[PDB]
Amino acid sequence: AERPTLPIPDLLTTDRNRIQLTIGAGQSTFGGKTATTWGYNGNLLGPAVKLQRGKAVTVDIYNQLTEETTLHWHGLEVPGEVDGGPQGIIPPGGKRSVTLNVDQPAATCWFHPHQHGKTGRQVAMGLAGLVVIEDDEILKLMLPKQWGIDDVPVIVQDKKFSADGQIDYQLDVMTAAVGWFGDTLLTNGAIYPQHAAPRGWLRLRLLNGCNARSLNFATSDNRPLYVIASDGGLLPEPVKVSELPVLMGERFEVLVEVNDNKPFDLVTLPVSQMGIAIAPFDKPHPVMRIQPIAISASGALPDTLSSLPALPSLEGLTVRKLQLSMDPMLDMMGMQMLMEKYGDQAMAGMDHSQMMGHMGFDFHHANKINGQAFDMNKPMFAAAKGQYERWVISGVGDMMLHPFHIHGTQFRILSENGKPPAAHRAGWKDTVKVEGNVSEVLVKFNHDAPKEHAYMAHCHLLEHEDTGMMLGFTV
Ligand SMILES: [Cu+2]
Ligand SMILES: [Cu+2]
């Protein structure tokens, strides 16, 4: 049969300078089986909210679920009051209005729930949206810009399904250790869709929307990807890559050539991550089928995209240390449950070093920062407003992958997991890899966050966040 077309999220702009988002339960079909799913302005996933830098907009958010949620704008530099972390509770049948005064460069950001201890479940049920920030600078470049034709959002997510076809989500000792992962890959909510792309340049806005699964994009015929933007917006010039690793909650925009009429796949390559490396993710896995077409397409790859500032001198900067840890009992219990469920396949992708690390009680608070499981009532510290700080985040002592995310900022990576960052990760980021080594970011918070609307800093492996690997901080 024909592959289904890639679903394109609606590009939603202001009215009275207002935007309406409805959070609701409905139904979706996956592999011919119906499931209860949640969506923003529909059944599953959500729209792309389109924002202009320097232009205020009001968002009216209606919770039509039968349980509490929050709405977090991932990668937006906004005050804590509108950040929608776990303190931004919207009750069932409630409404919250937020004024977003956008004051950052053009970027692809996203939005999702941040309900305390339930973020994994609420994203797994289908809640995620996009944010497209535009500025004068990006619109001058003549990048591909026809939304849903040559400028395409690609939200990649895995799920697992029970026998009846319902989403099979559980926060248990296995998923608290290694994450919630599945055997079914979704692309804008569809299984292995096709996208009809005009000949010339195709812009893909890639979002890893998975709870726990790291991805590594490539093409089926090894044509290159040209990275043009990271989480926080444009690189100074394009970076040519043959593969593109993307952690949970990271975005990159890439241009790819649609040259001849022969279709090719966007794929994800096997990653060395425990549980994630298991079949069917032990071989290259198709993400979507690009079908070349002949219709209007004038987008270009510019030699120069933007100016990236020199890093400042680090002397005098406040240093914060964040030591990530997991109770040895959770590693043991969680690993034991993984090995019970997958047997001989359980150590897929793992080298000798990775396995010897695993040497051979309430799990809801077993994941920690600085020896502390997340305490919603006790911000770990008071950060300075408008001042560079150096944040040193360590996974030394721990075997697992931790995409570390900091609210309220776009930062510069100084060191990523004991190496300088790759060229395409050296610009504006809101996520940094921590995996058995130490990362160092240069962060600045331009907006206030008081105690009662604190910013979060957490692992974006959502089951780790939900079982304690989060801290609140004031600005
Ligand atoms: Cu965030
Ligand atoms: Cu983690």
Short mmCIF file of C-alpha atoms and ligand atoms in Angstrom, two decimals:
data_model
loop_
_atom_site.label_atom_id
_atom_site.label_comp_id
_atom_site.label_asym_id
_atom_site.label_seq_id
_atom_site.Cartn_x
_atom_site.Cartn_y
_atom_site.Cartn_z
CA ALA A 1 0.00 0.00 0.00
CA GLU A 2 1.03 3.70 -0.35
CA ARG A 3 2.78 5.34 2.67
CA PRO A 4 0.52 7.93 4.36
CA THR A 5 1.48 11.61 3.79
CA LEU A 6 3.45 13.32 6.60
CA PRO A 7 0.93 15.19 8.82
CA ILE A 8 1.74 18.97 8.83
CA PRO A 9 0.92 20.84 12.09
CA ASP A 10 -1.09 24.04 11.50
CA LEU A 11 0.99 27.26 11.67
CA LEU A 12 -1.01 29.22 14.34
CA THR A 13 -0.57 33.06 14.48
CA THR A 14 -2.25 35.75 16.73
CA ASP A 15 -5.92 36.88 16.26
CA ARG A 16 -6.74 40.89 19.36
CA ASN A 17 -3.10 39.49 19.56
CA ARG A 18 -4.42 36.24 21.26
CA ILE A 19 -3.83 32.50 20.52
CA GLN A 20 -6.18 29.69 21.75
CA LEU A 21 -4.83 26.23 22.77
CA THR A 22 -7.27 23.48 23.88
CA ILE A 23 -5.74 20.43 25.71
CA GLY A 24 -8.06 17.40 25.14
CA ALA A 25 -8.45 13.60 24.90
CA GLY A 26 -9.47 11.94 21.62
CA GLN A 27 -8.53 9.05 19.35
CA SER A 28 -5.79 8.30 16.77
CA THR A 29 -5.11 5.23 14.58
CA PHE A 30 -1.69 3.42 14.55
CA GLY A 31 -1.14 0.28 12.38
CA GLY A 32 -4.95 -0.10 11.99
CA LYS A 33 -5.62 -0.01 15.81
CA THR A 34 -7.41 2.94 17.58
CA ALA A 35 -5.87 4.46 20.79
CA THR A 36 -6.92 7.11 23.33
CA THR A 37 -4.47 10.01 22.62
CA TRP A 38 -4.15 13.64 23.89
CA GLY A 39 -3.57 16.70 21.67
CA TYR A 40 -3.40 20.51 21.59
CA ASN A 41 -6.18 21.83 19.25
CA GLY A 42 -6.93 18.18 18.24
CA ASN A 43 -6.41 14.44 18.85
CA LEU A 44 -2.61 14.17 18.92
CA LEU A 45 0.46 16.45 19.07
CA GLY A 46 -0.31 20.10 18.40
CA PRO A 47 0.12 23.14 16.18
CA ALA A 48 3.20 25.26 15.42
CA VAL A 49 2.69 28.54 17.36
CA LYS A 50 4.33 31.25 15.19
CA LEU A 51 5.93 34.19 17.16
CA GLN A 52 7.77 37.39 16.02
CA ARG A 53 10.71 38.69 18.12
CA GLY A 54 9.77 42.01 19.86
CA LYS A 55 5.97 41.39 19.39
CA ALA A 56 3.90 40.45 22.53
CA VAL A 57 1.12 37.78 22.18
CA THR A 58 -1.40 36.34 24.69
CA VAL A 59 -2.08 32.58 24.78
CA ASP A 60 -5.37 31.31 26.30
CA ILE A 61 -4.85 27.67 27.39
CA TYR A 62 -7.95 25.49 28.16
CA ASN A 63 -7.36 22.19 30.05
CA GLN A 64 -10.21 19.86 28.84
CA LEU A 65 -8.50 16.73 30.33
CA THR A 66 -9.87 15.09 33.55
CA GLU A 67 -6.44 15.65 35.21
CA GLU A 68 -4.08 18.57 35.97
CA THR A 69 -1.44 19.57 33.38
CA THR A 70 1.02 22.44 32.74
CA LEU A 71 2.23 24.07 29.51
CA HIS A 72 6.02 24.58 29.30
CA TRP A 73 7.56 26.52 26.35
CA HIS A 74 10.85 24.58 25.91
CA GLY A 75 13.67 26.94 24.79
CA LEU A 76 11.76 30.23 25.27
CA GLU A 77 13.55 32.91 27.27
CA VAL A 78 10.48 34.04 29.34
CA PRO A 79 9.96 34.87 33.06
CA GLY A 80 9.28 31.94 35.45
CA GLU A 81 5.64 33.17 35.79
CA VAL A 82 4.79 31.99 32.20
CA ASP A 83 7.43 29.18 31.98
CA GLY A 84 4.78 26.52 32.83
CA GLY A 85 7.03 24.15 34.83
CA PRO A 86 5.42 21.93 37.54
CA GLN A 87 4.08 24.99 39.54
CA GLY A 88 2.00 26.24 36.52
CA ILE A 89 -0.88 23.85 37.34
CA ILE A 90 -4.02 24.18 35.14
CA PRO A 91 -6.88 22.21 36.77
CA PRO A 92 -9.34 20.11 34.73
CA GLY A 93 -11.89 22.52 33.10
CA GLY A 94 -9.57 25.45 34.01
CA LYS A 95 -7.99 28.16 31.85
CA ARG A 96 -4.67 30.03 32.09
CA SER A 97 -3.70 33.06 29.94
CA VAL A 98 0.05 33.89 29.44
CA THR A 99 1.63 36.94 27.78
CA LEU A 100 4.77 35.95 25.81
CA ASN A 101 7.09 38.95 25.17
CA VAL A 102 9.45 37.15 22.69
CA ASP A 103 13.00 38.60 23.00
CA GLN A 104 15.38 36.05 21.45
CA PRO A 105 16.60 35.18 17.93
CA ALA A 106 14.63 33.07 15.37
CA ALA A 107 14.57 29.37 16.41
CA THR A 108 12.41 26.24 16.43
CA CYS A 109 11.27 25.76 20.08
CA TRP A 110 8.49 23.44 21.32
CA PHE A 111 5.91 23.09 24.09
CA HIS A 112 4.80 20.19 26.24
CA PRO A 113 3.45 19.39 29.71
CA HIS A 114 5.59 19.59 32.87
CA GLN A 115 3.12 18.06 35.43
CA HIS A 116 5.14 17.03 38.54
CA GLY A 117 6.09 13.27 38.34
CA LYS A 118 3.72 12.79 35.29
CA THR A 119 5.64 14.55 32.44
CA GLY A 120 6.61 11.20 30.81
CA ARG A 121 2.99 9.91 30.83
CA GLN A 122 1.49 13.18 29.49
CA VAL A 123 4.02 13.45 26.59
CA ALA A 124 3.62 9.66 25.84
CA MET A 125 -0.21 10.20 25.64
CA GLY A 126 0.45 12.68 22.75
CA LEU A 127 0.92 16.24 24.16
CA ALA A 128 3.58 18.18 22.24
CA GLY A 129 3.58 21.29 20.05
CA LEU A 130 6.01 23.51 18.13
CA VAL A 131 7.02 27.14 18.47
CA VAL A 132 8.39 28.93 15.36
CA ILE A 133 10.18 32.18 16.36
CA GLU A 134 10.94 34.55 13.45
CA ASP A 135 13.07 37.72 13.37
CA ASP A 136 14.11 40.24 10.68
CA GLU A 137 17.55 38.56 10.32
CA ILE A 138 16.31 35.04 9.33
CA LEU A 139 13.64 36.30 6.86
CA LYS A 140 16.41 38.17 4.89
CA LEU A 141 18.20 34.80 4.12
CA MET A 142 15.82 33.22 1.50
CA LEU A 143 16.04 29.80 3.18
CA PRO A 144 13.24 27.38 2.15
CA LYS A 145 10.13 28.91 3.84
CA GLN A 146 6.96 27.31 2.37
CA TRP A 147 5.50 25.72 5.54
CA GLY A 148 4.55 22.05 4.90
CA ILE A 149 6.12 22.05 1.38
CA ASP A 150 9.90 22.81 1.56
CA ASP A 151 9.98 24.01 5.25
CA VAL A 152 8.83 20.91 7.18
CA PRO A 153 8.55 20.07 10.91
CA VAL A 154 9.64 16.47 11.68
CA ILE A 155 8.62 15.44 15.22
CA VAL A 156 10.07 11.97 15.81
CA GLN A 157 8.73 9.91 18.76
CA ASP A 158 8.66 6.21 19.75
CA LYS A 159 5.70 4.53 21.52
CA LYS A 160 4.83 1.03 22.67
CA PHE A 161 1.25 -0.30 22.44
CA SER A 162 -0.57 -2.98 24.47
CA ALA A 163 -2.52 -5.85 22.75
CA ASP A 164 -5.78 -3.77 22.48
CA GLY A 165 -3.77 -0.97 20.71
CA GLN A 166 -3.71 1.47 23.69
CA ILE A 167 -0.49 3.37 24.52
CA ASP A 168 1.37 1.09 27.01
CA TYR A 169 2.97 3.68 29.45
CA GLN A 170 4.22 2.84 32.97
CA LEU A 171 6.58 4.54 35.39
CA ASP A 172 8.17 1.42 37.00
CA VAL A 173 11.69 0.51 38.20
CA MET A 174 12.75 -0.44 34.59
CA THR A 175 11.51 2.83 33.02
CA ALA A 176 12.82 4.91 36.02
CA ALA A 177 16.31 3.40 35.23
CA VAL A 178 16.55 3.28 31.40
CA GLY A 179 13.48 5.30 30.25
CA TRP A 180 10.15 4.59 28.57
CA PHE A 181 10.94 3.36 25.02
CA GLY A 182 9.00 1.37 22.39
CA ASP A 183 9.22 -0.58 19.16
CA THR A 184 7.04 1.80 17.04
CA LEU A 185 8.43 5.03 15.52
CA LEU A 186 6.09 7.94 14.78
CA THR A 187 6.79 10.91 12.55
CA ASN A 188 4.36 13.78 13.21
CA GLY A 189 2.21 10.96 14.70
CA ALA A 190 2.27 8.68 11.60
CA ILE A 191 4.18 5.42 11.00
CA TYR A 192 6.77 5.86 8.15
CA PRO A 193 4.99 8.60 6.18
CA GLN A 194 6.03 10.12 2.80
CA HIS A 195 6.66 13.85 2.20
CA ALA A 196 6.33 15.23 -1.36
CA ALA A 197 9.19 17.78 -1.65
CA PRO A 198 9.97 20.12 -4.55
CA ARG A 199 13.32 19.68 -6.36
CA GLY A 200 16.12 21.79 -4.87
CA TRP A 201 16.52 22.41 -1.10
CA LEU A 202 14.32 20.85 1.60
CA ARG A 203 14.44 22.37 5.14
CA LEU A 204 13.56 19.90 7.93
CA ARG A 205 12.93 21.23 11.50
CA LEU A 206 13.87 18.10 13.48
CA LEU A 207 12.53 17.58 17.02
CA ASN A 208 13.41 14.55 19.10
CA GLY A 209 10.09 14.31 20.99
CA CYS A 210 10.88 10.85 22.50
CA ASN A 211 10.66 10.35 26.30
CA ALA A 212 13.99 8.49 26.49
CA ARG A 213 15.21 7.51 22.98
CA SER A 214 18.26 9.24 21.45
CA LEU A 215 18.23 9.43 17.61
CA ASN A 216 20.90 9.77 14.91
CA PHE A 217 19.57 11.06 11.57
CA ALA A 218 21.04 10.22 8.16
CA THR A 219 19.77 9.54 4.65
CA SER A 220 19.32 6.07 3.10
CA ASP A 221 21.74 6.94 0.22
CA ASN A 222 24.27 8.85 2.44
CA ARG A 223 23.61 12.32 0.87
CA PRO A 224 24.70 14.95 3.43
CA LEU A 225 22.57 17.04 5.84
CA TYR A 226 23.47 20.75 6.11
CA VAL A 227 22.82 21.89 9.72
CA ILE A 228 21.65 25.55 9.76
CA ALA A 229 20.21 25.90 13.35
CA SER A 230 20.34 24.32 16.80
CA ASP A 231 17.85 24.57 19.78
CA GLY A 232 18.34 28.38 20.15
CA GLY A 233 18.57 29.31 16.46
CA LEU A 234 20.91 29.85 13.52
CA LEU A 235 24.51 28.67 13.35
CA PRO A 236 26.97 31.23 11.94
CA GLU A 237 27.28 29.15 8.72
CA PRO A 238 26.02 25.72 7.57
CA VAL A 239 27.75 22.59 8.93
CA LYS A 240 27.85 19.59 6.57
CA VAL A 241 27.31 16.22 8.43
CA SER A 242 26.74 12.59 7.24
CA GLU A 243 24.91 11.78 10.52
CA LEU A 244 23.18 13.98 13.12
CA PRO A 245 22.76 12.78 16.71
CA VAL A 246 19.74 14.43 18.41
CA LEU A 247 19.05 14.01 22.13
CA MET A 248 15.57 14.03 23.71
CA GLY A 249 14.03 17.55 23.49
CA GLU A 250 16.74 18.91 21.11
CA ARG A 251 15.95 20.51 17.74
CA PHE A 252 18.10 21.06 14.64
CA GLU A 253 17.13 22.52 11.30
CA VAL A 254 18.86 20.85 8.32
CA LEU A 255 18.79 21.42 4.56
CA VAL A 256 18.94 18.32 2.33
CA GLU A 257 19.23 18.18 -1.48
CA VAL A 258 16.15 16.91 -3.42
CA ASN A 259 18.15 16.62 -6.69
CA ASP A 260 16.78 13.78 -8.96
CA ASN A 261 13.24 12.20 -8.97
CA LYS A 262 14.43 9.03 -7.03
CA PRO A 263 12.86 8.83 -3.52
CA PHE A 264 15.18 8.41 -0.49
CA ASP A 265 14.56 7.93 3.25
CA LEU A 266 15.42 9.99 6.27
CA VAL A 267 16.62 7.22 8.68
CA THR A 268 17.82 6.98 12.30
CA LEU A 269 20.98 4.96 12.89
CA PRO A 270 21.51 2.57 15.84
CA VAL A 271 22.76 4.39 19.03
CA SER A 272 24.84 2.91 21.87
CA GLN A 273 22.20 3.57 24.60
CA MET A 274 20.89 0.79 26.96
CA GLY A 275 17.38 -0.49 25.96
CA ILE A 276 17.16 2.00 23.03
CA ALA A 277 19.74 -0.14 21.07
CA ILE A 278 17.32 -3.20 21.07
CA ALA A 279 15.53 -4.39 17.91
CA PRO A 280 14.10 -2.92 15.84
CA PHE A 281 16.49 0.03 16.60
CA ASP A 282 19.61 -2.26 16.25
CA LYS A 283 19.68 -1.53 12.43
CA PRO A 284 19.02 1.70 10.47
CA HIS A 285 15.30 2.54 10.90
CA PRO A 286 13.31 4.58 8.33
CA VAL A 287 11.81 7.86 9.70
CA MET A 288 10.13 9.17 6.52
CA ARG A 289 10.19 8.72 2.71
CA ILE A 290 11.07 11.89 0.71
CA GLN A 291 9.31 11.79 -2.70
CA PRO A 292 10.81 14.39 -5.11
CA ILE A 293 8.12 16.45 -7.05
CA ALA A 294 8.27 19.32 -9.65
CA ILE A 295 6.49 22.42 -8.07
CA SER A 296 7.70 26.02 -7.16
CA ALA A 297 10.80 25.91 -4.81
CA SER A 298 13.35 28.82 -4.75
CA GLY A 299 14.92 28.25 -1.24
CA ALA A 300 18.76 28.41 -1.04
CA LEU A 301 21.58 27.36 1.36
CA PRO A 302 23.30 30.66 2.38
CA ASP A 303 27.14 30.67 2.84
CA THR A 304 26.65 32.98 5.89
CA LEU A 305 23.59 32.66 8.19
CA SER A 306 24.29 34.86 11.29
CA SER A 307 27.03 36.26 13.57
CA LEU A 308 27.82 34.13 16.66
CA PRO A 309 29.50 36.17 19.42
CA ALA A 310 32.94 35.29 20.86
CA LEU A 311 32.66 33.62 24.28
CA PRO A 312 33.50 36.02 27.13
CA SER A 313 36.50 35.51 29.47
CA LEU A 314 35.44 32.98 32.24
CA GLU A 315 37.45 34.64 35.10
CA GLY A 316 35.15 35.86 37.94
CA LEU A 317 32.06 33.87 36.75
CA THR A 318 29.95 32.14 39.48
CA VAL A 319 30.40 28.34 39.12
CA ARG A 320 27.52 25.96 39.99
CA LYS A 321 28.16 22.17 40.26
CA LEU A 322 25.23 19.78 39.50
CA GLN A 323 26.12 16.10 40.21
CA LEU A 324 23.60 13.73 38.62
CA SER A 325 23.13 10.37 40.41
CA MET A 326 20.90 7.30 40.56
CA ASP A 327 20.54 5.10 43.70
CA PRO A 328 22.55 1.89 43.01
CA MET A 329 19.33 -0.04 44.00
CA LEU A 330 17.48 1.56 41.02
CA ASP A 331 20.30 0.62 38.59
CA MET A 332 20.14 -2.99 39.98
CA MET A 333 16.31 -3.33 40.10
CA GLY A 334 15.85 -1.53 36.74
CA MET A 335 18.58 -3.51 34.97
CA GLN A 336 17.12 -6.79 36.47
CA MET A 337 13.66 -5.91 35.01
CA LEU A 338 15.14 -4.99 31.56
CA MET A 339 16.95 -8.39 31.45
CA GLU A 340 13.72 -10.23 32.47
CA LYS A 341 11.77 -8.50 29.65
CA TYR A 342 14.39 -8.70 26.80
CA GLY A 343 16.64 -11.68 27.83
CA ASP A 344 19.67 -12.29 25.48
CA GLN A 345 18.93 -9.01 23.57
CA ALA A 346 18.92 -6.77 26.72
CA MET A 347 22.59 -5.62 26.37
CA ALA A 348 22.17 -4.71 22.64
CA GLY A 349 24.61 -1.96 21.55
CA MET A 350 26.64 -2.17 24.84
CA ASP A 351 30.47 -2.55 24.81
CA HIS A 352 32.51 -4.35 27.55
CA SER A 353 33.03 -1.01 29.46
CA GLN A 354 29.25 -0.17 29.46
CA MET A 355 28.30 -3.60 30.96
CA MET A 356 31.11 -3.81 33.63
CA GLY A 357 29.79 -0.41 34.92
CA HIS A 358 26.60 -2.33 35.98
CA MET A 359 29.06 -4.50 38.08
CA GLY A 360 29.44 -7.80 36.18
CA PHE A 361 13.38 1.62 48.88
CA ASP A 362 11.22 4.10 46.86
CA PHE A 363 12.24 4.38 43.14
CA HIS A 364 10.07 7.59 42.76
CA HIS A 365 12.91 9.59 44.56
CA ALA A 366 15.98 7.51 43.49
CA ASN A 367 17.15 9.92 40.73
CA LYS A 368 18.98 12.96 42.13
CA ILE A 369 20.89 16.21 41.67
CA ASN A 370 23.49 17.01 44.41
CA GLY A 371 22.18 14.01 46.42
CA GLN A 372 18.59 15.44 46.38
CA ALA A 373 15.45 14.15 44.58
CA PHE A 374 13.39 17.13 43.24
CA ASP A 375 11.70 19.09 46.08
CA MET A 376 9.03 21.40 44.54
CA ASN A 377 8.94 23.51 47.80
CA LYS A 378 12.78 24.12 48.04
CA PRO A 379 14.66 25.77 45.10
CA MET A 380 18.27 24.46 45.25
CA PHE A 381 19.65 28.01 44.66
CA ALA A 382 19.15 31.67 43.69
CA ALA A 383 20.84 32.49 40.33
CA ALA A 384 21.79 36.09 39.31
CA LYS A 385 19.61 37.91 36.67
CA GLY A 386 21.43 39.12 33.49
CA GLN A 387 24.85 37.71 34.61
CA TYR A 388 26.87 34.88 32.95
CA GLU A 389 27.34 31.80 35.18
CA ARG A 390 29.33 28.60 34.51
CA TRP A 391 27.24 25.46 35.28
CA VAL A 392 29.26 22.21 35.56
CA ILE A 393 26.99 19.12 35.19
CA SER A 394 28.55 15.69 35.98
CA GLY A 395 27.38 12.11 35.23
CA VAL A 396 30.69 10.71 36.63
CA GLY A 397 29.68 7.69 38.76
CA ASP A 398 26.67 6.90 36.54
CA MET A 399 26.29 4.76 33.39
CA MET A 400 23.15 6.35 31.84
CA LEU A 401 22.50 9.10 29.22
CA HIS A 402 21.28 12.48 30.62
CA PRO A 403 20.29 15.20 28.12
CA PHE A 404 20.46 18.06 30.62
CA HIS A 405 18.02 20.92 29.98
CA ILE A 406 17.96 24.37 31.68
CA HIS A 407 14.78 26.53 31.58
CA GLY A 408 14.76 30.26 30.83
CA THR A 409 17.90 30.41 28.67
CA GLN A 410 19.80 29.61 25.53
CA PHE A 411 23.35 28.80 26.61
CA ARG A 412 26.74 28.17 24.98
CA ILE A 413 28.38 24.73 25.52
CA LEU A 414 32.01 25.16 26.74
CA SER A 415 32.58 21.39 27.20
CA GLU A 416 30.27 18.51 26.20
CA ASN A 417 30.82 15.27 28.12
CA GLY A 418 34.64 15.86 28.31
CA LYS A 419 35.12 17.20 24.71
CA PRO A 420 34.69 20.64 23.10
CA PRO A 421 31.36 20.74 21.28
CA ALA A 422 30.97 19.70 17.63
CA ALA A 423 30.71 22.73 15.25
CA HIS A 424 26.90 22.26 14.90
CA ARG A 425 26.53 22.16 18.78
CA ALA A 426 28.76 25.23 19.44
CA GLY A 427 25.98 27.83 18.99
CA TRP A 428 22.78 28.40 20.97
CA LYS A 429 21.58 25.32 22.94
CA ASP A 430 19.13 24.56 25.80
CA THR A 431 20.35 20.90 26.15
CA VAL A 432 23.85 19.39 26.81
CA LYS A 433 24.83 15.67 26.75
CA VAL A 434 25.94 14.24 30.14
CA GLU A 435 26.96 10.54 29.97
CA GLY A 436 29.61 9.27 32.41
CA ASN A 437 31.62 12.53 32.11
CA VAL A 438 31.34 16.29 32.80
CA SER A 439 29.73 19.09 30.79
CA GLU A 440 30.20 22.87 31.24
CA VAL A 441 27.77 25.50 29.89
CA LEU A 442 27.85 29.33 29.91
CA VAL A 443 24.33 30.42 30.93
CA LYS A 444 22.59 33.83 31.38
CA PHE A 445 18.99 34.37 32.66
CA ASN A 446 17.52 37.60 31.22
CA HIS A 447 14.15 37.18 33.13
CA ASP A 448 12.93 36.88 36.78
CA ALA A 449 11.78 33.60 38.37
CA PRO A 450 10.62 33.93 42.03
CA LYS A 451 10.23 30.91 44.44
CA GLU A 452 6.54 30.29 43.55
CA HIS A 453 7.35 30.27 39.75
CA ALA A 454 10.92 28.82 39.84
CA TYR A 455 12.83 27.66 36.72
CA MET A 456 13.69 23.94 36.37
CA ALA A 457 17.04 22.39 35.46
CA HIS A 458 16.60 18.66 34.76
CA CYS A 459 17.44 15.52 32.79
CA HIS A 460 15.12 15.41 29.69
CA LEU A 461 15.02 11.62 29.84
CA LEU A 462 11.49 12.16 31.19
CA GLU A 463 11.35 9.06 33.51
CA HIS A 464 14.56 10.37 35.26
CA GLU A 465 12.97 13.88 35.65
CA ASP A 466 9.76 12.24 37.02
CA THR A 467 11.68 10.16 39.64
CA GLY A 468 13.80 13.02 40.98
CA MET A 469 16.49 14.26 38.51
CA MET A 470 15.29 17.91 38.59
CA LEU A 471 16.05 21.04 40.67
CA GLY A 472 14.13 24.34 40.92
CA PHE A 473 16.13 27.59 40.92
CA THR A 474 15.14 31.30 41.28
CA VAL A 475 16.51 34.21 39.18
CU CU B 1 12.39 23.57 28.99
CU CU B 2 18.88 11.20 33.10
#
